[PDB]
């Protein structure tokens, strides 16, 4: 009932949402807006602009000169216009002229940033502020048009690139309040967020003291509880930062009902399974994307990432040939092929494409760590160290980069020198079994057995499944034997053997050494009967394992 | 009566009054619920392949294989269509998919052999055509492709024997007779070529290939 | 089943050389009339 | 004159970033074909042998044993190698079963 009324409301708004955003020649949200409408659940053109016929002629000149890449010429003709709708277009032309121009200026420059972590840019910012004061609304009014809301978006994005954070955030919120359904506005808002605790502060602000302009937006939409962008914000920031989830479950299934055919949702839904190390279900989710939407070079970088672990080289070889046929200039298509070339143990060629994939778009910092790995398999440790190190200098909060840099030193004999890198990676993702176990190995190899005991013990708690503790238990018991307290190591020896029974007789290698050692000690304890069953249960190991237990079985059998 | 007449008429051979078959499958499509079933589209694919309408061939074959990925009734036509279009990548997918699933059936090895054939690997593809022929007799595609591997590069002497085996063991098709006559032309022997071609025209009256030859 | 390229033949060497010779005849005899 | 007014072909504004022409060589790169060219890496006639082995891995034990030294002659006479010989005409169904039989079946002269 009410859901159907909502569906009829979304279609009107999304038809409106994609109209002016494409009409104003920004494609960050225009491309996404039409995607949402296409995937919307099945249940006269609309247009309007307050422009005079005299100034409307300038719009045709301004709009057509925009997408023809002649941004500068558009500025010259559109200099004297005073309408806010056009004033945004002139400064948007100026900004994209600079943003484009900066790209050609640096192409040999791979790493982006400033080592310590304007004037031409400040010219645009002053024009925004000068025009904003002169105009006779200046937001915070019911009669606030789309353009003034859209103008604030440019002010926010131009402020962020100067690194004036906490003021662009306020500007985006003002623009978003006057006009939601601007996907590109949300993404810039999401970028300026840095930590999960900031999201909780931002999430609260969107709930108590945030309301939309009911005049501009259609009815039954301005309510925060029934909005869609606020929902889409929840699935985006809460999981890309891997933050603590709240108000996330009931929203996700609500979006799947309204958007059953939205390509973006399923791929994000597939990525959620990917992020949880659940690859088999991830493959099924992604297989629907390729069949339904065969030409989507947006999230396939994870698809070709899954296939490499799957070792489905034939399926990956199909993707490399198919993806490369579309175009070789996207960041992803130069990352899809590199995975395929890496699986064939051809590293000197795969290393080339990863550098290629990064040059096209420098924002893809995930390719640095992969570029580092292909050097280590090449037995070239010197080149790898720089490759990993650039990744952390782009953004210090990179768990992948720290770990990949820590291993490269661990491969060499410099065990202690790698302790600092692993320690730094610990603070990024403490709730991970993988990082904790490696720290224990580093402490074990540097003669710090007292510390390594507590390190492994922390790793055990973090493990989600008891099965994964088989490897840690056997090694943890050896260190106690190195500390010469045989009674203490017995309890851990019981657990590692008992996981074999809980796993319906897994009969793995590191439990074979467990039973042989346990039986040997039990002979010294004088309990031959309790040691006899241990030898028989381990009679399905290696060639030396079986004979060791067989002779032990005969010895305890005679004294039985 | 009428629905079974149309259903049997779907499977009849082409080269003769195909417009009647078009009318019949058109009647069967909309009047009854059999609008997009397996054999009607198989007949459409066969019609397109005979008339070399390879774009519609690939379109129909894809919209049917999307439903049944291993339908052996259409796979020979699909593989021939892909060979003509030289879609190397799709052919490799199909070859791997059938290799992982149906190693015994000769369709898989015919697919692998034609994948090699599309890459100019006649000398190697000879062996895989032989394998496909052995794993399944009475298969025109495998033996005809083997004879093609023989005649394509050198070694003209026994291409005649291969085509003679094709003609004798597979009576009733004009194609082996036409090929044998063509090869007799290639060696510049004329009367025998004319005799084989008149035999082929007797077998098939309506075929551009035989009349052109 | 696959069909190969049907037999097609092009200009041989004998006929083109014969046309060359005839063409020389006609560009050789007319200047005698001119002279 | 008139250069940018025509839009009948791929131009400098159809691709997203005009500066991608700086590289403009990635289009002319032949991508290594899936299976056989994996052997040229190991070698750094052999590549085709690895293609044969790669596509030959998809056999059953008995089927491969049948095809270990199988040779097919032009006229249809097939020779089968036993690891005796099973020279006979192909396209009769019995010969292949007889090769299967002498391959996996048990034969004992018993003095």
Curated annotation (Swiss-Prot), chain A:
Keywords: Cell cycle, Cell division, Centromere, Chromosome, Kinetochore, Mitosis, Nucleus, Phosphoprotein, Repeat, TPR repeat, Ubl conjugation pathway. Pfam families: ANAPC8, TPR_11, TPR_8. It comes from Saccharomyces cerevisiae (strain ATCC 204508 / S288c). The gene is CDC23. Changing residue 39 to D: In CDC23-54; G2/M cell cycle arrest at 37 degrees Celsius. Changing residue 406 to D: In CDC23-1; G2/M cell cycle arrest at 36 degrees Celsius. Component of the anaphase promoting complex/cyclosome (APC/C), a cell cycle-regulated E3 ubiquitin-protein ligase complex that controls progression through mitosis and the G1 phase of the cell cycle. The APC/C is thought to confer substrate specificity and, in the presence of ubiquitin-conjugating E2 enzymes, it catalyzes the formation of protein-ubiquitin conjugates that are subsequently degraded by the 26S proteasome. This is Anaphase-promoting complex subunit CDC23. Pathway: Protein modification; protein ubiquitination. Changing residue 240 to K: In CDC23-49; G2/M cell cycle arrest at 37 degrees Celsius. PANTHER family: CELL DIVISION CYCLE 16,23,27, CELL DIVISION CYCLE PROTEIN 23 HOMOLOG. Belongs to the APC8/CDC23 family. Changing residue 419 to F: In CDC23-56; G2/M cell cycle arrest at 37 degrees Celsius. One of its GO terms (molecular function) is cyclin binding. Changing residue 50 to S: In CDC23-44; G2/M cell cycle arrest at 37 degrees Celsius. It is found in: Nucleus; Chromosome, Centromere, Kinetochore.
Curated annotation (Swiss-Prot), chain B:
Phosphorylated by CDC28, which is required for the early mitotic activity of the APC/C in its CDC20-bound form. It is found in: Nucleus. TPR repeats lie at residues 1-29, 39-67, 74-101, 106-135, 140-168, 175-203. It comes from the Eukaryota. Component of the anaphase promoting complex/cyclosome (APC/C), a cell cycle-regulated E3 ubiquitin-protein ligase complex that controls progression through mitosis and the G1 phase of the cell cycle. The APC/C is thought to confer substrate specificity and, in the presence of ubiquitin-conjugating E2 enzymes, it catalyzes the formation of protein-ubiquitin conjugates that are subsequently degraded by the 26S proteasome. Present with 2753 molecules/cell in log phase SD medium. The APC/C is composed of at least 13 subunits that stay tightly associated throughout the cell cycle: APC1, APC2, APC4, APC5, APC9, APC11, CDC16, CDC23, CDC26, CDC27, DOC1, MND2 and SWM1. Interacts with AMA1. Belongs to the APC6/CDC16 family. This is Anaphase-promoting complex subunit CDC16. It comes from Saccharomyces cerevisiae (strain ATCC 204508 / S288c). The gene is CDC16. The chain holds residues 426 to 638 of 840 of the full protein.
UniProtKB/Swiss-Prot annotation, chain C:
The APC/C is composed of at least 13 subunits that stay tightly associated throughout the cell cycle: APC1, APC2, APC4, APC5, APC9, APC11, CDC16, CDC23, CDC26, CDC27, DOC1, MND2 and SWM1. CDC26 is required to tether the essential subunits APC9, CDC27 and CDC16 to the complex. Component of the anaphase promoting complex/cyclosome (APC/C), a cell cycle-regulated E3 ubiquitin-protein ligase complex that controls progression through mitosis and the G1 phase of the cell cycle. The APC/C is thought to confer substrate specificity and, in the presence of ubiquitin-conjugating E2 enzymes, it catalyzes the formation of protein-ubiquitin conjugates that are subsequently degraded by the 26S proteasome. The lineage of its organism: Eukaryota, Fungi, Dikarya, Ascomycota, Saccharomycotina. This is Anaphase-promoting complex subunit CDC26. Transmembrane segments: none annotated. It comes from the Eukaryota. The modification Phosphoserine is found at residue 12. It comes from Saccharomyces cerevisiae (strain ATCC 204508 / S288c) (Baker's yeast). The chain holds residues 1 to 35 of 124 of the full protein. Belongs to the CDC26 family. It is found in: Nucleus.
Swiss-Prot record, chain D:
The keyword Acyltransferase does not apply. This is Anaphase-promoting complex subunit SWM1. Component of the anaphase promoting complex/cyclosome (APC/C), a cell cycle-regulated E3 ubiquitin-protein ligase complex that controls progression through mitosis and the G1 phase of the cell cycle. The APC/C is thought to confer substrate specificity and, in the presence of ubiquitin-conjugating E2 enzymes, it catalyzes the formation of protein-ubiquitin conjugates that are subsequently degraded by the 26S proteasome. The APC/C is composed of at least 13 subunits that stay tightly associated throughout the cell cycle: APC1, APC2, APC4, APC5, APC9, APC11, CDC16, CDC23, CDC26, CDC27, DOC1, MND2 and SWM1. SWM1 interacts directly with CDC23 and APC5, and is required to tether APC9, CDC16, CDC26 and CDC27 to the complex. Belongs to the APC13 family. GO terms for biological process: anaphase-promoting complex assembly; anaphase-promoting complex-dependent catabolic process; ascospore wall assembly; cell division; protein ubiquitination; regulation of meiotic cell cycle; regulation of mitotic cell cycle; regulation of mitotic metaphase/anaphase transition. Keywords: Cell cycle, Cell division, Meiosis, Mitosis, Ubl conjugation pathway. One of its GO terms (cellular component) is anaphase-promoting complex. InterPro entries: Apc13 (IPR008401). The keyword Cell division applies. Pathway: Protein modification; protein ubiquitination.
């Amino acid at each position: 009932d009410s859901q159907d009324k909502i569906i009829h409301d979304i279609r009107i708004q999304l038809r409106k949402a994609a109209t002016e955003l494409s009409r104003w020649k920004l494609y960050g949200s225009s491309k996404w807006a039409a995607e949402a409408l296409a995937g919307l659940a099945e249940a006269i053109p609309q247009n309007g602009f307050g422009l005079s016929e005299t100034e409307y002629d300038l719009y045709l000149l301004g709009s057509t000169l925009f997408d023809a890449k002649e941004f500068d010429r558009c500025v010259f003709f559109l200099k004297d216009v005073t309408n806010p709708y056009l004033k945004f277009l002139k400064l948007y032309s100026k900004f994209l002229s600079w943003d484009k121009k900066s790209q050609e200026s640096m192409e040999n420059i791979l790493t982006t940033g400033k080592f310590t972590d304007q004037s031409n840019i400040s010219s645009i910012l002053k024009e925004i502020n000068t025009f904003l004061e002169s105009y006779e609304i200046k937001i915070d009014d019911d009669e606030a048009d789309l353009g003034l809301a859209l103008l604030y978006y440019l002010r926010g994005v131009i402020l962020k690139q100067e690194k004036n954070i906490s003021k662009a955030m306020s500007s985006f919120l003002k623009s978003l309040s006057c006009y939601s359904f601007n996907w590109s506005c949300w993404l810039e808002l999401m970028d300026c967020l840095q930590k999960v605790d900031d999201a909780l502060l931002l999430n609260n602000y969107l709930y108590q003291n945030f309301q939309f302009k009911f005049s501009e937006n259609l009815g039954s939409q301005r309510t925060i509880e029934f909005n869609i962008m606020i929902k889409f914000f929840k699935l985006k920031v809460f999981e890309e930062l891997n933050g603590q989830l709240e108000d996330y479950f009931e929203d996700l299934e609500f979006l799947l009902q309204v958007f059953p055919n939205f390509t973006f949702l399923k791929a994000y839904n597939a990525t959620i399974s990917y992020n949880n190390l659940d690859y088999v279900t991830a493959e099924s989710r992604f297989d629907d994307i390729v069949k339904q939407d065969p030409y989507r070079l947006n999230d396939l970088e994870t698809y070709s990432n899954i296939l490499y672990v799957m070792q489905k080289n034939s399926k990956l070889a199909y993707l490399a040939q198919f993806v490369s046929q579309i175009d070789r200039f996207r960041p992803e298509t130069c990352c899809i092929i590199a995975n395929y070339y890496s699986a064939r143990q051809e590293h000197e060629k795969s290393i080339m494409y990863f550098r290629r994939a990064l040059t096209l778009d420098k924002k893809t910092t995930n390719a640095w760590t992969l570029m580092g790995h292909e050097f280590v398999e090449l037995s070239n440790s010197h080149a790898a160290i720089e490759c990993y190190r650039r990744a952390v200098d782009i953004c210090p909060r990179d768990f992948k980069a720290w770990f990949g840099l820590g291993q490269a030193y661990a491969l060499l004999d410099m065990h202690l020198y790698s302790l600092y890198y692993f320690q730094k990676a610990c603070t990024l993702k403490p709730w991970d079994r993988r990082i904790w176990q490696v720290l224990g190995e580093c402490y074990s190899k540097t003669g710090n057995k007292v510390e390594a005991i507590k390190c492994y013990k922390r790793s055990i708690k973090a493990s989600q499944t008891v099965d994964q503790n088989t490897s840690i238990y056997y090694r943890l018991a050896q260190l106690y034997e190195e500390l010469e307290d045989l009674q203490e190591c017995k309890k851990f020896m019981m657990k590692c053997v008992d996981v074999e029974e809980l796993l319906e007789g897994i009969v793995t290698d590191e439990t074979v050494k467990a039973r042989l050692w346990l039986a040997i000690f039990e002979i010294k304890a004088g309990n031959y009967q309790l040691a006899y069953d241990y030898a028989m249960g381990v009679s399905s190991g290696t060639s030396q394992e079986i004979e060791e237990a067989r002779m032990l079985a005969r010895e305890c059998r005679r004294h039985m | 009566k009428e629905i079974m007449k149309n259903l049997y008429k779907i499977n009849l051979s082409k080269y003769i009054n195909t417009e009647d078959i078009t009318k019949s499958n058109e009647i069967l499509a909309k009047d009854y619920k059999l609008a997009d079933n397996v054999d009607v589209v198989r007949s459409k694919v066969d019609i397109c392949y005979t008339q070399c309408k390879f774009n519609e061939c690939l379109e129909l074959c894809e919209t049917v294989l999307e439903n049944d990925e291993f339908n052996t009734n259409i796979l020979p036509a699909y593989i021939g269509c892909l060979y003509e279009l030289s879609n190397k990548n799709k052919l490799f997918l199909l070859s791997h998919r059938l290799a992982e699933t149906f190693p015994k059936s000769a369709i898989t090895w015919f697919s692998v052999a034609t994948y090699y054939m599309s890459l100019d690997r006649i000398s190697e593809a000879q062996k895989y055509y032989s394998k496909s022929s052995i794993l399944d007799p009475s298969f025109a595609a495998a033996w005809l492709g083997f004879a093609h591997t023989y005649a394509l590069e050198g070694e003209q002497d026994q291409a005649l024997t291969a085509y003679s085996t094709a003609s004798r063991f597979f009576p009733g098709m004009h194609l082996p007779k036409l090929f044998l006559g063509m090869q007799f032309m290639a060696m510049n022997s004329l009367n025998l070529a004319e005799s084989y071609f008149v035999l082929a025209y007797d077998i098939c009256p309506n075929d551009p290939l035989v009349l052109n030859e | 089943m696959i069909r190969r390229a049907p037999t097609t033949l092009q200009l041989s060497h004998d006929d083109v050389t014969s046309l060359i010779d005839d063409l020389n005849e006609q560009k050789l005899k007319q200047q005698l009339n001119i002279e | 004159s008139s250069s940018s007014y025509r839009d009948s072909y791929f131009q400098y504004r159809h691709l997203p970033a005009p500066h991608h022409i700086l590289y403009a060589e990635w289009n002319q790169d032949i991508l290594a074909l899936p299976d056989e060219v994996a052997n040229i890496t190991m070698a750094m006639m052999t590549s085709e042998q690895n293609s044969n082995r790669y596509w030959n891995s998809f056999h059953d034990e008995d089927d491969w044993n049948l095809f270990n030294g199988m040779e097919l002659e032009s006229n249809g006479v097939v020779t089968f190698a036993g690891q005796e010989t099973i020279t006979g005409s192909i396209f009769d169904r019995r010969i292949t079963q007889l090769a299967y039989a002498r391959n996996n079946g048990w034969h004992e002269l018993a003095l």
